């Protein structure tokens, strides 16, 4: 019995790329023209692409012509596709032809969540309000759950650069980003310097100032 199978599907964000691959069973794709097809939530089917024998051709549908790319491996027998909210579909690798000159895979799910960008949340890592003596204190601005990079962090808008350490962003098991931005200043200037962190997020056009202060 003739088989194909799809791998590489999951959750993509808007504008995104993700790559799909097609393994087959018991047959040789070399003399075939293979075709990927997606089914839309409308239930309706959609030929996405087709690559010919010897790869003499690669024909794309119009709503995907230029973000997408198909390729074939006539030796280990694999086909592939490179890569919108509307691209959300179940994707089927397919083989055209006949028993004389027709065969499909189970499909894999592909979804594209609508937001290309998400602004960051600015919260104050407070020193303390009991403060006094004449020692070091440390405060800051915890910039959480943005994407994509980057997040430039400033303090008072250009004037307190000394003792400042803007930590590298970390990729949460959620996929959203997260950077700590700290500054060592006197335990004695906690009350008069006020400390203002200017988190400018260029991708989502988001600018959130946040006052850092003792609770």
Partner 1 sequence: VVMTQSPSTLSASVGDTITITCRASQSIETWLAWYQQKPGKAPKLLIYKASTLKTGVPSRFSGSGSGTEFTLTISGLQFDDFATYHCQHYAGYSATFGQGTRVEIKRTVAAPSVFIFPPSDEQLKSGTASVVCLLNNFYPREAKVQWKVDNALQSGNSQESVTEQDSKDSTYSLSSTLTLSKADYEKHKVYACEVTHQGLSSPVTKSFNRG
Which spans of this chain sit near partner 1 (rule: CB under 8 A)?
Answer: 33, 35, 39, 42-47, 50, 52, 57, 59, 61, 92, 96, 98-99, 102-107, 114, 121, 123-126, 128, 136-138, 140, 142, 144, 162-163, 165-170, 172, 178-180, 182, 184, 215
Q: Residues near 45 by Cβ (< 8 Å), separated by ≥ 6?
A: 37, 38, 39
Query: If contact means CB under 5 to 8 A according to the sort of partner, which of partner 1, its own copies, none does residue 43 touch?
Result: partner 1
Q: Residues near 214 by Cβ (< 8 Å), separated by ≥ 6?
A: 126, 127, 128, 129, 131, 190
> Among residues 52, 53, 71, 131, which is the contact residue for its own copies, using CB under 8 A?
71
Strands, E assignment, 28-176: 34-39, 45-51, 58-60, 69-73, 78-82, 89-95, 103-104, 108-113, 121-124, 136-146, 164-166
**82 near its own copies, rule: CB under 8 A:** yes
Rg (CA), the chain: 27
Stretch that binds its own copies, among 42-50, 132-140, 171-179, 203-211 (CB under 8 A): 171-179
- Max Cα separation, the chain? 91
Strands 136-146 and 177-186: antiparallel
**75 near its own copies, rule: CB under 8 A:** yes
DSSP 8-state class, residue 194: -
Query: If contact means CB under 5 to 8 A according to the sort of partner, which of its own copies, partner 1, none does residue 71 touch?
Result: its own copies
**124 near its own copies, rule: CB under 8 A:** no
**Interacting residues with its own copies (CB under 8 A):** 7-8, 10-11, 17-21, 55, 69, 71, 73, 75-76, 78, 80, 82, 109, 111, 113, 171, 173-175
């Amino acid at each position: 019995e003739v088989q194909l199978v799809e791998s590489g599907g999951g959750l993509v964000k808007a504008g995104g790329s993700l790559i799909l691959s097609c393994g087959v069973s018991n047959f040789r794709i070399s003399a075939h023209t293979m075709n990927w097809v997606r089914r839309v939530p409308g239930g309706g089917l959609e030929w996405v692409a087709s690559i010919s024998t010897s790869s003499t051709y690669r024909d794309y549908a119009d709503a995907v012509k230029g973000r997408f790319t198909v390729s074939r491996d006539d030796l280990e027998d694999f086909v592939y596709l490179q890569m919108r909210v509307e691209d959300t579909a179940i994707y089927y690798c397919a083989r055209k032809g006949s028993d004389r000159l027709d065969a499909w895979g189970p499909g894999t799910v592909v979804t594209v969540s609508p937001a290309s960008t998400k602004g960051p949340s600015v919260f104050p890592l407070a020193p303390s309000s009991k403060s006094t003596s004449g020692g070091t204190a440390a405060l800051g601005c915890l910039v959480k759950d943005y994407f994509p990079e980057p997040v430039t962090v400033s303090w008072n808008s250009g004037a307190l650069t000394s003792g400042v350490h803007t930590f590298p962003a970390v990729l949460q098991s959620s996929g959203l980003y997260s950077l700590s931005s700290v500054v060592t200043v006197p335990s004695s200037s906690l009350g008069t310097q006020t400390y203002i962190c200017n988190v400018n997020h260029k991708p989502s056009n988001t600018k959130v100032d946040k006052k850092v202060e003792p609770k």
